[PDB]
């Protein structure tokens, strides 16, 4: 919003060094803020792409930066019979730089490590390493948690268990507030994903120059897993820290696994001991869900909110085509124990291949409005594909879908603008957090400074009615009496660190609706309908109020005496900019509008006092809990008094209820303009009833409202209905309260069929007959106490006329038949053969809890008894299987209306061929 | 156990 | 008559033509201040005003070129036509629609070139042995389907970078499997070995000289090879007039875009050919893996069919990928690639059995509704694809093009092309909004108040300030009025509280964020219902407060789609014949049936219940349904064959249907639907 896209500071690095691949703010001891920039391809002393880190001091004009020197010589030591080796060529130093306190932590993800012992070696691989430095004291330290001295032969015999030879530690790094370094190793445990943590103090204390392989005492690493889902998940591709368990003492880690579960993606929230607390599965495969994760409080609730990026998400285009644009997921943290379900918002990029969500950077309170904001990056987005960064402002219920600002890449094409972002630090020290965007393609870093935000507050006060026969003032230069009314226009600008020379232009328009010659009201001073006051509010902590005189034109001049007079106040920054960027950004309600009208047929009293009556009647009384209830709130309005000005129908909707549409019975005005609004703590809908609601006018309004989320409520829900106007005496109608009962109900389908339904038996192993019973929870509410009893004739023995086999509860409802089915492991006019004739084989199928709309199917495997088929080959049999449905109770506060119960019959017709 |  | 043409417009020919397609205009000087100039043609013609001066443009579609569909294929490649007509010209008046039909044929003996892209990991050593003579075996099975067959070979392992590859000891760079006491080639990203050639013996020779290489991580760089094979048209040797099959054989997960960060590669993969004179992927070690979206763009652009010949352990992974890559088929591959020859033939037959249309470069002002005739003569509505076809079958699609208002471009052209077909239909749309009377325009005519306004088309279009029929009433000079028609009815608001009652006519307000129009300024284009924050769901234009939904969409909120492609189920019937289609979604009216396409039901009548009549329809041709066309329209099974009574491999529906002759018809249903009907039942 208030980021300045004109005065940019550009920091440049060596050409082709990828200066800007990663960056962070560094605050030295003196308090000055410097920028730490990583250049993972900076040439080393041997003309090799070792990488480097640059510490850029804050300068208005930017420019070059002095490099932060790190050791870049390949090391080698002989410990006993082994020869530890370190290879720093193409190590990518600076690929991840994080600053904490006075320590700069730059990692080299692709640094190689190798151990030689006799002929056998350790299979030189990119273990990775991270370099720690204190720029003030000059201290240097290193941390390579995945270095080992185990030969490659040992790993083969142990099935590559605890194989950390390819961690690439430092791929993603973050330092907790307590001061514990957390490194992401997407390749650890054979590309399974690894996480390494160690206090920064212990890393410095335990570091010893010339010792390539040491062990930090307090370090803790993640755990290897045999679950195939985690295979090749790159667990640790991105890492973030935050609070997600309600205990401020403990710190929780947010780890992204962009290829978890066969390239599905996932973000895991785990405590300091790596015990998983919650997992957020990706939405689309190969979308790289979890590529970037950010933790911030975007709704001012005091609880951190999780943001996940999916750069390669392909949104379903309107033409049934998939377009790769990227997506950012917002997971607002609910109150109490974490219950993060579906994402609370879905920000989707627009430019194809833009990789929206590639980098997410919390911005703090960019506008100081009380809600934290974020800046999502599209390194290849924008109309020209040069990349852009979008700024989203937090609000009381998450983020705003519309990006408040869009920063376009000032660099050439293919600069990867916005690949790395960082904010929440006031670099220039003007009270507003600033943003720095890295573009390693152009080897430059762009610094965006946040400008002060002015919260303009415009208030226009004017009369409610005009009486032309009350001419008091006289037109200047003449004495022709006219009807004059006062117009008060209070303007107030407030903000933090705003300039003391703040000026505002307040434009007043009288009767803006009509054309210039159609204006009915004019100002006494200029005899014109409109003025532009220049208000300077520098140093003013209270609104500035100005008053003018507006007179009603002569009655014979204008014929329209019914259309309300509309007064507008525009307010805007002065054009003093003269081409330069305005030092401030005007924000808030800068445009107000108020109405006034000529006193028309208000009676001898010259005051319009209306009388308003309302009637409430709801249709669809049963509000089934868990069902998308739609209620028709049929209503009637009567203006039994005089004319009502700006008559509006007020409906107080509960949290579950939502306005859908409102239709009136007036042919000319059948559709009512309803404006949903969240009045103090209860949402309300304002539907117009005609601005000059005529006397003796009755309007019947039928509104459809969607009521949901009734589970977290009582037996009933009520609505507030009132008709409010802008008259002086009796402006509002009596509030009519309408209550609708809330009920929980559900129904279940009991159906089954025979496979085959009929099987002509020509008359042990023989014809195959199986019965399948399926239950569907079609009811709006969930079901609990699922019970089923199937009556199957027979004994599963030679006495049985139809051998039976194992019963399969596909839905998940186990049962026990009365006679033990399949005693042997081997699978060896019709008369109603019910279960009565033989021992009734009844299976106690119980599923207890049944999800809404869920279907459970139980099938029985049976075969006609071959010896029994031969005997009695002249008696047609129709094997009838009967089942009974049963429910304990709906799991709700009030599950009335009995419980679902069914009675279904399934039979198979043998059709004795030799009957 | 793991790999190609 | 109180039609829309007379109510609105009545100001100029230009405005009335945009009122609605049915409106006309009379520029004749007759009827002075009488009947409205704009109305239905019969209304205008009925009241005289017909000196052949009525401007009533009619939308027309002309076939600029339509060669007949070639019936034989092969022969001369240039003359092989699979879509007819090939070019059509559309002239659409404002907010008008015109229907046009096209035909698509799967010509027999159409040339096909198959490019074999085989993963060469160490686990594919067994596979490479069975492929040894796949060139001749593939040729024999294809010569019965195509005269012109050309086969190429390509291999891939992974990026030769520090991870994914063994870089130590130094010997490992030359013999990666040296730690296993074996010899193998050094790792390579993608290696084109044999360009598409008709000499099938070359394929056998090249495969015999190939060898495997060993990498570290399970995922392979397969998608890198697919991109290079698709975009290296000259190197690979694709023929424009031929079916392009890209057999992609692998037995492991595949690296996707953004995986190159492990190797340090961050540059996005551009869809360019980087295969050099050495036939190796030059940018393998310096460019990231392609994304799914990029591959689909290049596969669709090059008209290449991708076949995932993968093994069992990754069949689901590539099946899920195939969902995100439309136009791809997945085939289960044996662990030794022993059934690849049958996999290719089945894949090719499946590819040629379907026709799906795609629209390219469609202007935003146009919408299209497609109806498919497919096999038989049932016109499934809102469907752009026909499945179940065999070679030689012709399907016809009826398309209606509707324009959103009057675009100012006046010349647009889009292409309708079936997926995988070189042939396409080029539609040239020429919008026609202004009328011919505008040519004889008088900027300052003495008729229009001594030339203070422009005269054209038999009426006066007055300039600013001056209003009236002859521009003689000014703007404010006639504030008083006595014959004013500002109020639509007595006692109603003048000009609907949105205009000025000057000179009788209602002059509408500035119409902020919109435009107020009408005899009483009642109509507008900013009052339509917004379904999800967009007026008319962004699938329609507001016309006097009514959402005039364009083609492809319908409903008061223009949010119900007319597309029924979602309903189309593997079964070949809309929503599996168990329900209808409501705005794409399936309504499973059939009891016990559910799913996205009402395809899965476990409590419905068994196959036998109905398949009994399917055999009675063809195997017997008696009783009924034989005259109802069900034996062909509905019965896609086979006629009486035998009763093997041993085909339980997959789909074993044992049915002892009893016929009218009392014979026990033992028929077995057996994912091409096949009915093993008994040759002769026993009574
Ligand atoms: C490939 O196929 C589809 C592509 O979208 C996906 O299959 C689904 O995978 C999920 C995760 O394994 C399955 O989840 C489970 O579903 C049951 C309910 O069916 C639920 O009770 C469990 O808690 C769990 O969520 C899901 O069933 C499965 N769907 C189907 C139709 O099989 C997935 O992306 C891929 N499946 C693979 C790789 O197995
Ligand atoms: C694709 O098929 C559908 C369904 O046949 C076509 O829509 C239907 O087309 C017919 C013929 O134009 C319409 O008939 C009409 O009836 C209405 C009254 O209901 C009348 O006002 C029209 O003048 C006309 O006589 C029918 O309404 C229409 N829709 C439905 C729901 O049946 C569609 O046009 C076909 N598309 C193409 C490109 O051929
Ligand atoms: C749900 O099932 C139970 C049995 O599991 C039913 O209660 C039993 O019903 C039989 C048959 O009437 C009686 O002989 C038992 O004494 C009952 N047991 C009790 C009441 O504990 C029950 O009626 C079924 N559904 C409901 C709630 O009606
Ligand atoms: C657009 O639809 C019309 C029908 O509404 C088609 O006109 C029919 O064309 C066929 C084939 O020539 C004739 O058999 C019919 O007799 C015609 N109309 C009718 C219903 O009698 C028209 O061909 C379609 N599109 C084109 C290409 O103009
Ligand atoms: C198109 O929009 C309409 C609303 O304008 C949707 O109709 C709603 O459907 C749901 C589900 O049946 C009902 O609960 C609502 O009450 C309906 N609203 C109405 C009738 O105003 C309709 O479902 C939408 N269609 C699609 C495909 O989304
Ligand atoms: C084509 C290219 O990259 N040229 C660069 C040039 O822009 C840069 O100023 C210079 C710095 O040494 O290095 C070289
Ligand atoms: C965490 O430490 C603080 C000390 O600052 C202590 O008050 C708190 O109780 C500790 N947490 C728990 C769960 O005890
Ligand atoms: C808002 O509503 C709450 C709940 O009824 C009430 O406690 C509070 O005082 C209200 N705030 C107002 C009226 O400003
Ligand atoms: C049912 O049909 C299948 C397929 O023909 C056959 O394999 C099986 O043996 C049959 N079962 C019988 C005859 O019971
Ligand atoms: Ca905690
Ligand atoms: Ca929060
Ligand atoms: Ca904010
Ligand atoms: Ca700042
Ligand atoms: Ca009064
Ligand atoms: Ca193999
Ligand atoms: Ca690999
Ligand atoms: Mg492999």
Is B1 at the interface with chain A, CB within 8 A? yes
Answer for the pair A494, A501: CB distance below 8 angstroms, yes or no.
Answer: no
A274 min Cα distance to partner chain B (Å): 23
d(Cα C188, Cα C120) in Å, to the nearest integer? 9
Find the CB nearest A560 among C268, C326, C494. Answer: C494
Pocket lining: C320 vs ligand 1, CB cutoff 6 Å: yes
B3 min Cα distance to partner chain C (Å): 4
Strand pairing class (C149-156; C190-197): antiparallel
d(Cα A307, Cα A285) in Å, to the nearest integer? 18
Task: Give the number of the atom of ligand 1 that is nearest the alpha carbon of residue C317.
Answer: 38
Those residues whose C-beta lies under 8 Å from the C-beta of residue C500, and which sit 6 or more positions away, are A514, A515, A518, A560, C506, C507
Task: Give the number of the atom of ligand 3 that is nearest the alpha carbon of residue A899.
Answer: 27
Resolution stated for this PDB structure, in Å: 2.8
Burial class (CB in 10 A: 0-12, 13-18, 19+), A275: exposed
Q: Which ligand is nearest to the CA of A652?
A: 8
Chain C neighbors of B4, CB-CB under 8 A: 121-123, 214-218, 220, 252
Cβ <8 Å between B1 and A160: yes
Helix axes C134-142, C340-351, angle to 10 degrees: 30
Return the SS3 of C583: coil
For ligand 3, mutation pick of A750, A787, A846 (most atoms within 8 Å of CB)? A787
Binding residues of A for Ca(2+): 243, 245, 247, 250, 252, 297, 299, 301, 303, 305, 365, 367, 369, 371, 373, 426, 428, 430, 432, 434
Neighbours of C240 (CB within 10 A): 11
Q: Please list all protein residues whose beta carbon sits less than 5 angstroms from ligand 12, which is an ion.
A: A 365, 367, 369, 371, 373, 393
Task: Spell A574-598 as b/e; 16+ CB within 10 A means b.
Answer: eeeeeeeeeebbbbbebebebbbbb
Return the SS3 of C120: coil
At residue A552, φ and ψ (nearest 5 deg) are -80, 130
The answer to whether C77 is a known ligand-binding residue is no
d(Cα C438, Cα A345) in Å, to the nearest integer? 53
Burial class (CB in 10 A: 0-12, 13-18, 19+), C227: buried
- Number of residues written out for chain A: 915
Helices (H), C99-255: 125-130, 134-142, 200-208, 222-231, 233-236
CA-nearest residue of chain C to A380? C268
Nearest by Cα to A266 from A322, A219, A310, A227: A310
Chain C neighbors of B1, CB-CB under 8 A: none
Pocket lining: C629 vs ligand 2, CB cutoff 6 Å: no
Q: Could you identify the residue written with the tokens 């195959």?
A: A768
Pocket lining: C580 vs ligand 2, CB cutoff 6 Å: no
Answer for the pair A482, A613: CB distance below 8 angstroms, yes or no.
Answer: no
Any idea what the Cα angle at residue A402 is, between residues A398 and A404, rounded to 5°? 95
Chain A neighbors of C216, CB-CB under 8 A: 166
Whole-angstrom CA distances from A650 to A629, A719, A736, A775 are 21, 10, 10, 45
Neighbours of A176 (CB within 10 A): 18
Helix axes C222-231, C292-302, angle to 10 degrees: 30
Chain C interface, Cβ < 8 Å to B: 121-123, 214-218, 220, 252
Nearest by Cα to C335 from C116, C125, C141: C125
Is A190 at the interface with chain B, CB within 8 A? yes
Neighbours of C276 (CB within 10 A): 12
Neighbours of C643 (CB within 10 A): 18
Q: Which ligand is nearest to the CA of C217?
A: 16
Rounded-to-5 percentages of helix, strand, coil across chain B = 0, 0, 100
Ligand 6 centroid to residue A36 C-alpha, Å:
23
Is B1 at the interface with chain C, CB within 8 A? no
The answer to whether C278 is a known ligand-binding residue is no
Nearest by Cα to C179 from A76, A185, B3: B3
Ligand 3 centroid to residue A224 C-alpha, Å:
51
CA-nearest residue of chain C to B1? C218
Is A517 at the interface with chain C, CB within 8 A? yes
Q: How was this one solved?
A: cryo-EM
Q: Which chains touch A (3 or more CB pairs under 8 A)?
A: B, C
d(Cα A156, Cα A446) in Å, to the nearest integer? 49
Chain C neighbors of B2, CB-CB under 8 A: 218
The ligand 8 site (C-beta within 6 Å) comprises A 680-681
Note the Cα C292 to chain centre separation in Å: 19
Query: Is the Cα dihedral A156, A157, A162, A164 positive or negative?
Result: negative
Q: Report residue A799 as tokens.
A: 């006495």
* DSSP state for residue A733 in the 8-state scheme: P
Burial class (CB in 10 A: 0-12, 13-18, 19+), C101: middle
Task: State the Rg of chain C over Cα.
Answer: 34
For ligand 8, mutation pick of A681, A682, A683 (most atoms within 8 Å of CB)? A681
Nearest by Cα to C320 from A286, A355, A282, A322: A286
Q: Report residue A661 as tokens.
A: 């549409």
d(Cα A114, Cα A84) in Å, to the nearest integer? 6
Nearest by Cα to C109 from C342, C352, C306, C346: C352
Q: Which chains touch B (3 or more CB pairs under 8 A)?
A: A, C
Any idea what the Cα angle at residue A354 is, between residues A353 and A358, rounded to 5°? 115
Chain B neighbors of A159, CB-CB under 8 A: 1-2
Q: Could you identify the residue written with the tokens 């002249």?
A: A874
Mutate to test the interface with C, among B1, B2, B4 (most CBs of C within 10 A): B4
Pocket lining: A851 vs ligand 1, CB cutoff 6 Å: no
Answer for the pair A312, A286: CB distance below 8 angstroms, yes or no.
Answer: yes
Q: Could you identify the residue written with the tokens 């005259």?
A: C627
Cβ <8 Å between C162 and A112: yes
Those residues whose C-beta lies under 8 Å from the C-beta of residue A491, and which sit 6 or more positions away, are A456, A457, A458, A459, A504, A506, A535, A537, A543, A544, A545, A546, A569, A571
Q: Output the residue whose Cα is nearest ligand 5's atom 16.
A: A630
Q: Report residue C616 as tokens.
A: 């009675």
Nearest by Cα to C435 from C6, C12, C7, C8: C12
Q: Could you identify the residue written with the tokens 């445009």?
A: A591
Whole-angstrom CA distances from A724 to A594, A660, A690, C480 are 16, 21, 12, 37
Return the SS3 of C88: strand
d(Cα C438, Cα C459) in Å, to the nearest integer? 11
Cβ <8 Å between B1 and A159: yes
- Number of residues written out for chain C: 683
Neighbours of C622 (CB within 10 A): 12
d(Cα C417, Cα C361) in Å, to the nearest integer? 11
Domain span at residue A252 reads: 1-452
Those residues whose C-beta lies under 8 Å from the C-beta of residue A290, and which sit 6 or more positions away, are A237, A238, A256, A257, A258, A260, A265, A266, A267, A280, A282, A308, A309, A310
Q: Which ligand is nearest to the CA of C371?
A: 2
d(Cα A668, Cα C520) in Å, to the nearest integer? 12
For ligand 9, mutation pick of A768, A802, A803 (most atoms within 8 Å of CB)? A768
Task: Give the number of the atom of ligand 8 that is nearest the alpha carbon of residue A680.
Answer: 1
Ligand 11 centroid to residue A332 C-alpha, Å:
5
Cis peptide before A192 (omega within 30 of 0): no
d(Cα A894, Cα C449) in Å, to the nearest integer? 80
């Amino acid at each position: 919003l208030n980021l300045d896209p004109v005065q940019l500071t550009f920091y440049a690095g060596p050409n082709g060094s990828q200066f800007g691949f990663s960056l962070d703010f560094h605050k030295d001891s003196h308090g000055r803020v410097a920028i730490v920039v990583g250049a993972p391809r900076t040439l080393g002393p041997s003309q090799e792409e070792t990488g480097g880190v640059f510490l850029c001091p804050w300068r208005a004009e930017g420019g070059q930066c002095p490099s932060l020197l790190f050791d870049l010589r390949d090391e080698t030591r002989n410990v006993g019979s082994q020869t530890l080796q370190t290879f720093k060529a193409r190590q990518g130093l600076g690929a991840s730089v994080v600053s904490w306190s006075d320590v700069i932590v730059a990692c080299a993800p692709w640094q190689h490590w190798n151990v030689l012992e006799k002929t056998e070696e350790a299979e030189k691989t990119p273990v990775g390493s991270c370099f720690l430095a204190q720029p003030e004291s000059g201290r240097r330290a290193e941390y390579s948690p995945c270095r080992g001295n185990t030969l490659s032969r040992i790993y083969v015999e142990n099935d590559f268990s605890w194989d950390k030879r390819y961690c690439e530690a430092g791929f993603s790094s973050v330092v907790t507030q307590a001061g514990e370094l957390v490194l992401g190793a997407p390749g650890g445990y054979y590309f399974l994903g690894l996480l390494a943590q160690a206090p920064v103090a212990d890393i410095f204390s335990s570091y010893r120059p010339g010792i390539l392989l040491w062990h930090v005492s307090s370090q803790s690493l993640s755990f290897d897993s045999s679950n195939p889902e985690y295979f090749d998940g790159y667990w640790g591709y991105s890492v973030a820290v935050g609070e997600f368990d309600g205990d401020l003492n403990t710190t929780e880690y947010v780890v992204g696994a962009p290829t978890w579960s066969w390239t599905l993606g996932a973000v895991e929230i785990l405590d300091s001991y790596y015990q998983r607390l919650h997992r957020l599965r990706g939405e689309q495969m190969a979308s790289y869900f979890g590529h970037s994760v950010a933790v911030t409080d975007v709704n001012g609730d005091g609880r951190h909110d999780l943001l996940v990026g999916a750069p390669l998400y392909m949104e379903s285009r309107a033409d049934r085509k998939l377009a790769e644009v990227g997506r950012v997921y917002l997971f607002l943290q609910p109150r109490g124990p974490h219950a993060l379900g579906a994402p609370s918002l879905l920000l989707t990029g627009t430019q194809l291949y833009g990789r929206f969500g590639s980098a997410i950077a919390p911005l703090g309170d960019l506008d100081r409005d009380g809600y934290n904001d974020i800046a999502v990056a599209a390194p290849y987005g924008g109309p020209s594909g040069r990349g852009q960064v979008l700024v989203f402002l937090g609000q009381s219920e998450g983020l705003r879908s519309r990006p408040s600002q869009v920063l376009d890449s000032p660099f050439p094409t293919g600069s990867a603008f916005g690949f790395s972002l960082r904010g929440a630090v006031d670099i220039d020290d003007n009270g507003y957090p600033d943003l720095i965007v890295g573009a390693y393609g152009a080897n430059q870093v762009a610094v965006y400074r946040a400008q002060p935000v002015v919260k303009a507050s415009v208030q226009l006060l004017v009369q409610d009615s005009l009486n032309p026969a009350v001419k008091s003032c006289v037109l200047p230069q003449t004495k022709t009496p006219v009807s004059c009314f006062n117009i008060q226009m209070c303007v107030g600008a407030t903000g933090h660190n705003i300039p003391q020379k703040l000026s505002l232009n307040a434009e007043l328009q009288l009767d803006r609706q009509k054309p210039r010659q159609g204006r009915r009201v004019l100002l006494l001073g200029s005899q014109q309908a409109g003025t532009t006051l220049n208000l300077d509010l520098g140093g003013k902590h209270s609104p500035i109020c100005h008053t003018t005189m507006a007179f009603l034109r002569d009655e014979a001049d204008f014929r329209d005496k019914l259309s309300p007079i509309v007064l507008s106040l525009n307010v805007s920054l002065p054009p003093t900019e003269a081409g330069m960027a305005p030092a401030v950004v005007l924000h808030g309600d800068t445009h107000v509008q108020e109405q006034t009208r000529i006193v028309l047929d208000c009676g001898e009293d010259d005051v319009c006092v209306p009388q308003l009556q309302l009637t409430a009647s709801v249709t669809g009384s049963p509000l089934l809990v868990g069902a998308d209830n739609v209620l028709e709130l049929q209503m009637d309005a009567a203006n039994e008094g005089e004319g009502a000005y700006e008559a509006e129908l007020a409906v107080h909707l509960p949290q579950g209820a939502h306005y859908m549409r409102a239709l009136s019975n007036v042919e000319g005005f059948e559709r009512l303009i309803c404006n949903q609004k969240k009045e103090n703590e209860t949402r309300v809908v304002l539907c117009e009833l005609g601005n000059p609601m005529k006397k003796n006018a009755q309007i019947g309004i039928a509104m459809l409202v969607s009521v949901g989320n009734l589970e977290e409520a009582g037996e009933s829900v009520s609505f507030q209905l009132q008709i409010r106007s802008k008259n002086s005496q009796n402006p509002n109608s009596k509030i009519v309260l309408l209550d609708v009962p809330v009920r929980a109900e559900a129904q279940v389908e009991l159906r089954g069929n025979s496979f085959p339904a009929s099987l002509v038996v020509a008359a042990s192993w023989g014809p195959k007959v199986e019965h399948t019973y399926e239950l569907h929870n079609n009811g709006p509410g969930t079901v609990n106490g699922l019970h089923l009893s199937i009556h199957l004739p027979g004994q599963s023995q030679p006495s049985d006329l139809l051998y039976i086999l194992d019963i399969q509860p596909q839905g998940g409802l186990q049962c026990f038949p009365q006679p033990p089915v399949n005693p042997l492991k081997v699978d060896w006019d019709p008369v109603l053969v019910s279960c009565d004739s033989a021992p009734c084989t009844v299976v106690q199928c119980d599923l207890q809890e049944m999800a809404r709309g869920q279907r459970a199917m139980v099938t029985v495997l049976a075969f006609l008894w071959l010896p029994s088929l031969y005997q009695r080959p002249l008696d047609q049999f129709v094997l009838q299987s009967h089942a009974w449905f049963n429910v304990s109770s709906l799991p709700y506060a009030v599950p009335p209306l009995s419980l679902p119960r069914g009675e279904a019959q399934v039979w198979t017709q043998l059709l004795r061929a030799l009957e | 156990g793991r790999g190609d | 008559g109180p039609n829309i043409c007379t109510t609105r417009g009545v100001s100029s020919c230009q405005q009335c033509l945009a009122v609605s397609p049915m409106c006309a205009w009379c520029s004749d000087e007759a009827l002075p201040l009488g009947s409205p100039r704009c109305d239905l043609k019969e209304n205008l013609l009925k009241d005289n005003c017909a000196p052949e001066s009525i401007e009533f443009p009619v939308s027309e579609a002309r076939v600029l070129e339509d060669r007949p569909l070639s019936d034989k294929g092969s022969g001369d490649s240039s003359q092989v036509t699979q879509v007819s007509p090939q070019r059509i010209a559309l002239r659409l008046r404002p907010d008008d629609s015109k229907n046009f039909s096209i035909q698509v044929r799967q010509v027999e003996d159409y040339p096909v070139d198959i490019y074999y892209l085989m993963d060469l990991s160490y686990s594919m050593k067994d596979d490479l042995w069975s492929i040894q003579n796949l060139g001749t075996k593939l040729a024999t099975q294809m010569r019965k389907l195509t005269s012109n067959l050309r086969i190429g070979f390509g291999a891939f392992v992974d990026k030769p970078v520090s991870p994914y590859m063994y870089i130590s000891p130094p010997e490992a760079l030359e013999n990666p499997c040296y730690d296993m006491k074996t010899t193998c080639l050094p790792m390579f990203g993608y290696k084109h070995v044999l360009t598409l050639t008709d000499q099938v013996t070359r394929f056998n020779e090249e495969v015999k000289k190939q060898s495997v290489s060993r990498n570290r991580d399970a995922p392979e760089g397969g998608f890198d090879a697919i991109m290079q094979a698709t975009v290296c048209d000259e190197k690979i040797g694709w023929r424009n007039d031929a079916s392009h099959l890209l057999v992609f054989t692998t037995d492991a997960k595949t690296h996707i875009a953004l995986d190159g960060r492990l190797a340090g590669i961050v540059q996005p993969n551009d869809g360019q050919c980087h295969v050099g004179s050495d036939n190796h992927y030059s940018a393998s070690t310096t460019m990231d893996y392609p994304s799914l979206g990029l591959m689909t763009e290049k596969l669709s652009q090059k008209n290449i069919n991708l076949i995932f010949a993968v093994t069992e352990n990754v069949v689901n992974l590539y099946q899920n990928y195939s969902e995100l890559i439309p136009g791809t088929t997945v085939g289960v591959l044996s662990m030794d690639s022993s059934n690849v020859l049958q996999l290719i033939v089945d894949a090719y037959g499946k590819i040629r059995s379907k026709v799906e249309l795609e629209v390219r470069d469609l202007p935003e002002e146009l919408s299209l509704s497609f109806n498919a005739t497919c096999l038989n003569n049932e016109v499934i509505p809102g469907l752009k694809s026909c499945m179940g076809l065999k070679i030689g079958d012709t399907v016809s699609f009826s398309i209606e093009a509707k324009v959103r208002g009057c675009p100012q471009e006046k010349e647009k052209s889009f292409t309708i092309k079936p997926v995988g077909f070189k042939d396409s239909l080029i539609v040239q749309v020429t919008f026609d909004c202004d009328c011919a009377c505008q040519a004889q325009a008088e900027p300052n005519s003495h008729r229009c108040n001594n030339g203070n306004g422009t005269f054209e088309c038999g009426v006066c279009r007055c300039g600013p300030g001056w209003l009236g029929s002859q521009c003689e009433c000014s703007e404010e000079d006639y504030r008083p009025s006595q014959q004013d028609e500002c109020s639509p009815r007595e006692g109603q608001p003048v000009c609907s509280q949105r205009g000025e009652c000057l000179c009788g006519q209602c002059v509408c307000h500035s119409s902020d964020f919109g435009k107020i129009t009408g005899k009483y300024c009642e109509c507008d284009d900013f009052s339509c219902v917004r379904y999800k924050g967009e007026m008319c769901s962004g699938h329609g234009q507001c016309s006097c407060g009514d959402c005039l939904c364009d083609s492809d969409w319908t409903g008061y909120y223009c949010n119900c789609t007319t597309r029924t492609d979602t309903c189309m189920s593997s079964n070949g019937l809309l929503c599996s014949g168990r329900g209808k289609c409501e705005c794409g979604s399936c309504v499973c009216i059939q009891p016990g049936s559910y799913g996205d396409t009402c395809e899965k039901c476990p409590t419905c009548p068994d196959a036998c219940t109905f398949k009994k009549e399917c055999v009675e329809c063809k195997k017997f041709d008696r009783g009924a349904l034989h005259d109802e066309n069900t034996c062909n329209r509905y019965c896609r099974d086979e006629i009486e064959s035998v009763k093997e009574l041993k085909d339980t491999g997959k789909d074993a529906v044992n049915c002892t249907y009893k016929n009218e002759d009392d014979c026990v018809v033992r028929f077995q249903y057996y994912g091409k639907s096949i009915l093993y009907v008994v040759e002769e039942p026993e009574c």
